[PDB]
Design a binder for this molecule. Structure first.
Ligand SMILES: *[C@@H](CC(=O)OCC)[C@H](C[C@@H]1CCNC1=O)NC(=O)[C@@H](CC(=O)[C@@H](NC(=O)c1cc(C)on1)C(C)C)Cc1ccc(F)cc1
Length: 187
């Protein structure tokens, strides 16, 4: 069936509740003190992590070479815990997937799992009026409150939930090359 065991292990060790002025989001920690959150969360220079106020040391809203929103923001956080390194679970390329799980960790839903079915490489999405690329699509009625939710299949962390129209759900891709270790003035 769906990979519930895999999704649970990712939730246990690699998720936190993140809270900005836009609300609460599931936040996936990727490695060391680096995590991801939907760009719509509007991260500033501090963020609440599990209700603890935390300095945001770096924040990078990803865009592609067309200067189009990818809806992923990568954050570096000032906190003592290191995240388990899950980069080796990230896909190398764009792909479609079978029988994925969407996993939420918020104050309202401290852990909840939703089998979303098949996931297709959707591409372009007008996301609440912002053009966005690299989007994954599932036919599941996802809802407000699930943004940031982790999308997995066994062995792979493939996206974070960012949108939905009452019939389909949409995730922003996570690619392995987003998190590899030059000299760049990026602000
Ligand atoms: C998650 C965030 C949340 O709860 O509110 C953030 C303040 C939310 C999940 C969806 C809400 C309804 N169902 C969901 O799964 N994400 C959003 O609200 C983004 C906006 C949307 O999802 C819109 N949907 C679409 O634009 C759309 C287009 C198509 C083909 O299908 N759906 C609304 C109709 C909900 C938030 C967002 C992200 C990026 C932006 F630039 C603007 C807004």
């Amino acid at each position: 069936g769906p990979g519930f065991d895999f999704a649970q292990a990712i939730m246990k060790k690699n998720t936190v509740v993140a809270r900005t002025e836009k609300g609460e989001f599931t936040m996936l920690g990727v490695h060391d003190r680096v995590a991801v959150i939907p760009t719509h969360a509007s991260v500033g220079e501090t963020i609440y992590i599990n209700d603890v106020e935390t300095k945001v040391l770096d924040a990078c809203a990803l865009r592609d070479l067309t200067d189009t929103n990818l809806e992923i923001t990568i954050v570096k956080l000032d906190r003592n815990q290191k995240f388990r390194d899950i980069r080796h679970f990230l896909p190398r390329y764009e792909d479609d997937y079978n029988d994925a799980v969407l996993s939420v960790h918020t104050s309202k839903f401290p852990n909840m799992y939703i089998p979303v079915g098949q996931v297709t490489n959707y591409g372009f999405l007008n996301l609440g009026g912002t053009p966005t690329h690299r989007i994954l699509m599932y036919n599941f009625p996802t809802r407000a409150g699930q943004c940031g939710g982790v999308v997995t299949t066994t062995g792979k962390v493939i996206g974070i939930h960012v949108g939905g129209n009452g019939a389909q759900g949409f995730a922003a891709m996570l690619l392995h090359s987003y998190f590899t270790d030059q000299k760049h003035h990026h602000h």
